[PDB]
Amino acid sequence: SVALVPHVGMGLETRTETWMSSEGAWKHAQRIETWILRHPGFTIMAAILAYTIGTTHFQRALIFILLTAVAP
Amino acid sequence: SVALVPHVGMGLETRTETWMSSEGAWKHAQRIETWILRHPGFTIMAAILAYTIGTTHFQRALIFILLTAVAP
Amino acid sequence: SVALVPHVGMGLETRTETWMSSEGAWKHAQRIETWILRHPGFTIMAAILAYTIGTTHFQRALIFILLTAVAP
Amino acid sequence: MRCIGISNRDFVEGVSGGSWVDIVLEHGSCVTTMAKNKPTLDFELIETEAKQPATLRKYCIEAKLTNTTTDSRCPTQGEPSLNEEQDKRFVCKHSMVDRGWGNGCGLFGKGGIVTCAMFTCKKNMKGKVVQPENLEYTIVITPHSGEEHAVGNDTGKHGKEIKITPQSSITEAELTGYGTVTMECSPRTGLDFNEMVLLQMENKAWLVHRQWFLDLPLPWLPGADTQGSNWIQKETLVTFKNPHAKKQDVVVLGSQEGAMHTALTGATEIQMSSGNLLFTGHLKCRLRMDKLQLKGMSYSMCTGKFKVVKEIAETQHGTIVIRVQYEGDGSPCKIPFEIMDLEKRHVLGRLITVNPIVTEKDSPVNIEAEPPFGDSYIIIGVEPGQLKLNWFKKGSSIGQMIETTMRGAKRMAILGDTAWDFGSLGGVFTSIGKALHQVFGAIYGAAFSGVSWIMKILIGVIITWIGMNSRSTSLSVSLVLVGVVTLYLGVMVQA
Amino acid sequence: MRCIGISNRDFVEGVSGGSWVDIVLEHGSCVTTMAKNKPTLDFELIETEAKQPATLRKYCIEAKLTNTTTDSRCPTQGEPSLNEEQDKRFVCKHSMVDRGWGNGCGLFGKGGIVTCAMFTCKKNMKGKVVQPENLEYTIVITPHSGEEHAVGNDTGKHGKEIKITPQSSITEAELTGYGTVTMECSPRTGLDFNEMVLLQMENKAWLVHRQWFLDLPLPWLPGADTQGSNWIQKETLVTFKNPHAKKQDVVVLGSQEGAMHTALTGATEIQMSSGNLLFTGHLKCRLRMDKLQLKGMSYSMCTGKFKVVKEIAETQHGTIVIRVQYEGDGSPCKIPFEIMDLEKRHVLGRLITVNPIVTEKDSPVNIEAEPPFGDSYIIIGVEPGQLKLNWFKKGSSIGQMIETTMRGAKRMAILGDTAWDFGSLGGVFTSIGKALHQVFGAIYGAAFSGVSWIMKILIGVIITWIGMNSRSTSLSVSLVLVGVVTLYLGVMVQA
Amino acid sequence: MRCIGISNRDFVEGVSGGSWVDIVLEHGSCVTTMAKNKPTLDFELIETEAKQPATLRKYCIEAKLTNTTTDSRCPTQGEPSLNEEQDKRFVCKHSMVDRGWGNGCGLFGKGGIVTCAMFTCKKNMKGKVVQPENLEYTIVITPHSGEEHAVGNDTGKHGKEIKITPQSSITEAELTGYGTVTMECSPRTGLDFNEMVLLQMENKAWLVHRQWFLDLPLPWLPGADTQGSNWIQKETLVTFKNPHAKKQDVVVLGSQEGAMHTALTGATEIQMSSGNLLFTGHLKCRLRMDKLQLKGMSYSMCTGKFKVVKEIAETQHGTIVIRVQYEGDGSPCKIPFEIMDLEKRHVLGRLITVNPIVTEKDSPVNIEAEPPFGDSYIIIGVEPGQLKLNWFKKGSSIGQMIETTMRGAKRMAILGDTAWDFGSLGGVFTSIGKALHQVFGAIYGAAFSGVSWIMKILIGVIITWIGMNSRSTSLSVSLVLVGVVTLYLGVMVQA
């Protein structure tokens, strides 16, 4: 809806603090761990799929973080 | 806000139509496509960084889609 | 409780004596040897576990002193 | 009756074992039951109702801050103290402002500050849980009598409405002319309450589940709370403004009525205005047809000159229906209805209005039957004055098993293991597939929860790509039941 | 003097040939300017006003639907149409339902249907726009005159207000004593309007990006408008409900206020209930200080007998402010202020309030200076009653260099190339380094746009990691300029 | 002369440079200053006082719970609610009890319960804080040439009692008959407040660390908090009894007063009664001996006939104190005091009471001096009646300079780098001796801060063992300053 596209990387930032800062600066990192801690099966399955695709460990951890981040 | 965690995969679905399917079933991909059509530099940078990492032709495309999808 | 955090190494210390020194300087050692006298079995077990790991004779006495003192 | 014209009608052919068959019926769909005797019936679940709900958690949707007071503290000495911090109506924040000589201090530094405002809720939202007991389904049975102007009308009193509860039993339903039906129904297993919450906004209501409803970012309050002033999660509906380093202020974050309708994309809407009326879900019935008379047995066969008064109309699923009228004597009689081929050799097709009957009158009757997939004569009389009616049916040869196959796969996509409950206890070939389907649905259900339309397609492409590029014959197990099935369940999702 | 205790101060030392220094002053900060033999001044922008706005586009926050009409046809008979579909204040949808004989139709298929509902707004959100013309800035010019009630005192007549408008941006300030001062401000190359929209909800206002404003999914209407009868995208705030393939319906989606407050994250709040008073952004100023006298040169020295009326009171950024009273003779006179040490006395410590004078003997005078990073002694009187005071200062040795480096790196992380306009005409180094910062700013821009707190840190570690593994000494590039700079910026994002 | 009998006496000679010398004096110690002329003085810090304090945080020691209420609720229907939970005097918690048909609800599950109790404080521990200004030190400057009954009496007025504030200056202090002594003291670098909290229990007080005081688990309260109801960390003094899965209860823990007296093992007791009197810490004085007369010049010598009235009485540090009484004619006169050997050819031994003098003949007078190790004779008077008294100072050796080395090493143990301030601008030994200590003190700081008596000895033994068995001659860098110094400081802590 309108609550998405949240006006973050638009430039226009000064040292005056913004509208909802230190409240929306960590909300994605809190809903992503609420979502992990209430859906463990997709995190495990994304660890198997992330461990399968990827030779080196860095791209395995990258595919794990990105696959865990695309799902809400 | 409350407008995220949008009650998508929970079970509980019947043959009866849910609250906003056909308006909340394509708007995510539409939001991503208009995001790319407004911000075309992160697509090129995600293509170069997705090409540099990923030493097969599949996980280059997988890392490209996932990096394109985590940035809103 | 506040029986812990005992204000020992806080700096701030001058030539005049503290609140209870020569009444709290040897209480820890007498306490951790009275605990040994009431509990020999952990001292034998920490001698064995201190003797298996610890290749050198300094790692053995160090791990024995540390494992003995870290159990109040 | 009541079911011709409704799409996704199911046909179940069986009375096997005793005289029972398991059926599973939803609110949108309908079920038609046939046998070698035991006349064809029609089943429609029309109503779920929860009787006495108990509220669980109330959420503040729109609020209002009143009586904003701030208190500042000069640096290096303590926190501010304001008397309204003691009351939990007031939302409070300690921030840290710049203070010097110019704003009434003695030292130059960064002193403390508090701001407080009384949080007043002014429009609510309440979710109510119910028990698996005291909820009453309403189901309509209607027989194929071929009554005049009874085809597909929801209005009108043609079928018996019976109401089933988990307090109920065998639940006899004496429907006249035909005998009785008993429906061994399992209402406790249908929609899985003690997991869902009957949410309620201003005039609408949804069917959301608990561990989505309990962890909402709105300020809430317990269900057993009169004088609803003590809101608990108030800091997610106000915001505090300390722009440069000067005074901080409070503002209400706004109204989440239209914001939470975005959160409900995936929830099925129910009707909590006058009673908790759920018009969604399914339930599993066991129909027992051991006491069904035929209503037309021991009537003498008819003797000629019928008359067509409504044209043959082809339904979806290819089952035509004709309304004819009888002229002649012996008015309680049967009807010589048969669909034969060209050359009139074999009797083809099947009747769905088993034992058609002229009910006592010069009033029309309705007959439903299915033709085969080519040309056919439809013959509605005896030889002096028959009615030969040509008919052609399109497709219906090899597309029928693929439509049946993918509606069975959609039936297994909407329902879970319960979709293995259209059969009459197949035993070693049905009752083991329900167990394999529920352990596969438990492994598949523990994964893939919380993901959407797009994500199941992406994971289906990934698992399919692992399967097409694997070894040791893990190709099959990695795509034929995991790779492709996830793609199909990703297309058929978001109903 | 208007500047003390604000925690963002940014001292400026020096001047370049012809006596002008190039500064950039912001709304949070207040710049202190120090020259060789010229009084030290204190500047702050305090008000940015947009004088006359023209509304660009009106969105609606909440609406309502009346006059619901519905029109259906037969299966094969085309598609419905009624005259509310051509009227552009009704919202409409074509769907498709089940038809049969029970609907009084025939042919047993799926027939089209339309639903129309009159759209009526009831809460608005007006996005106004201004041109870079008639955008008025207000800067106060407060000298370091040692004078009572002056240090952090942001009221009274301690400064002089000048007004930078882009058609005439020179407006020299004649202040009493100290001569005059001219400022060549460049307000067009600042915040870059014509691409920013002064958005306005009910009692709040934001300052949002223009292309961000023109692609919000919400029903809009042009700015120059009178009647609400042509809302363009009405489907973004209604929804159409077609369950069971029976009749469909339409409802309103709800009040979009708090969802928009979630959209307005990152936007800087302005206020436009009375005026259009912005309180964010910077302004580049060229400070020409040629006709700037000292107000107290060719006065004689004091005879002695000072007394302290307010103590030393160290500021953040490591300066001290003492307030002293004078008793003696010859009242227009110079304070013998020095910051010495003990025996074989060296001069260690710079004076900020340069040339402190006594005027109006029975009134205090507050002097500001800075000590070095240890013991230091303040000397005020001269032969009898020499007012020697101890003072100690913590840190300020090498940590002052890293605090200066973090002020320059934060100042370079907030401002763009304009951060290079903080010094007085470096010639080739400031111009070449600024030009390289415009190239690196234009390539770092049109990238990292729409990219948040987290994604810059992720995209910085996955370019630092591929920097450390690369060869041909590209490691000294992909770590330095794009690896850890984007990590640092990603920490400093969401200021 | 308020110096003989104190165990810590600290003789300092040399007024070199100009006529100044740095002395550092704490509360337990005295300081005796000598020179080539400029008579010998005795300095003792006697009192520190903090003038007006401001309280920082108020903890409670013992409390009281009344109005205990509770409210339980049936399973799966949410959390209970209670009107006392809205107030913050009431400590509350939620728990899970067993509930079934016996409790009167139903459903046989694990239910929710709340418990509330009003938390009233009744013993209060408040910790105050002061600024480094308005905090004065009281010093006593008592000169030698001891009259009737003044050897070590604190009682009586034999010297001046000047006060030093950081508001103050050169601090002139005129001595009656002597000249005028001035001290430029440093009361800001002395004890380093703003990390100090003047903690106050019922009748006692301590000087504790600030961050130690703020990290203290007890229910606290702001220093600016009138009507002390809103206690904050209340759950650290109450506890909740839920023994089985049945009802829970509240109980108070009890008086934490005796549990705080073990928290304070390592804090110095001050007395907060009729003022904030500190009796710990040191003070660095810049002693200046420009204007000092000897009080006894321009007199004649005696004519003989002394009489020893108090015996020889060796002070520890070997500085014997005799008391003689003169009988004669010219009453104001200089005493003929010498310390020579057996056959009186050499003068060996030093006089500390320099220029002894008889005033008011009918009053004994007492003289202090320093013999050498061994036999040394004391000659008082002239040839007709002089006193030749034996004294055998108990034979020492190198032992005196190993006691001096242990005394200065102990002074470096208590005082970190201020122990390098007994000299007079030493330069190439002293001014770098501070600096190389300050680099090593900030590294010894925060690497042994928080550890105790035992742990410094343990890390000392470890870090001298890993250096004792090392290579490349890191034996010196891991023994001579890191191992042995942490063993010595390990056995000198807990003063």
Ligand SMILES: *[C@@H]1O[C@H](CO)[C@@H](O[C@@H]2O[C@H](CO)[C@@H](O)[C@H](O)[C@H]2NC(C)=O)[C@H](O)[C@H]1NC(C)=O
């Ligand atoms: C559904 O059934 C009702 C009830 O039988 C039908 O309504 C009847 O219609 C006939 C002819 O129009 C009237 O003579 C009756 O009086 C009506 N009965 C009632 C109770 O109103 C209705 O027409 C049927 N709907 C269909 C076939 O679409």
Ligand SMILES: *[C@@H]1O[C@H](CO)[C@@H](O[C@@H]2O[C@H](CO)[C@@H](O)[C@H](O)[C@H]2NC(C)=O)[C@H](O)[C@H]1NC(C)=O
């Ligand atoms: C800021 O300055 C104004 C004037 O420049 C101060 O106002 C004066 O306050 C004194 C009290 O000390 C009054 O006697 C005067 O009459 C006031 N003058 C006015 C109102 O014009 C004001 O107190 C200063 N504020 C601070 C915080 O220093």
Ligand SMILES: *[C@@H]1O[C@H](CO)[C@@H](O[C@@H]2O[C@H](CO)[C@@H](O)[C@H](O)[C@H]2NC(C)=O)[C@H](O)[C@H]1NC(C)=O
């Ligand atoms: C310390 O000094 C005081 C002050 O002189 C001494 O007090 C005197 O003691 C003599 C002894 O007989 C009395 O005659 C005086 O009257 C006292 N003076 C007073 C009380 O003001 C005191 O004795 C000295 N201390 C010692 C240990 O001798």
Ligand SMILES: *[C@@H]1O[C@H](CO)[C@@H](O)[C@H](O)[C@H]1NC(C)=O
């Ligand atoms: C809020 O303000 C009104 C008047 O402004 C006052 O009467 C009322 O008591 C206040 N509420 C509280 C809780 O103090």
Ligand SMILES: *[C@@H]1O[C@H](CO)[C@@H](O)[C@H](O)[C@H]1NC(C)=O
């Ligand atoms: C909408 O309904 C109202 C109700 O009275 C009435 O004005 C009319 O029927 C409709 N108005 C329109 C279509 O403008």
Ligand SMILES: *[C@@H]1O[C@H](CO)[C@@H](O)[C@H](O)[C@H]1NC(C)=O
């Ligand atoms: C606590 O109980 C006493 C009973 O005597 C009652 O008077 C008092 O009002 C109660 N306190 C509160 C806060 O209700």
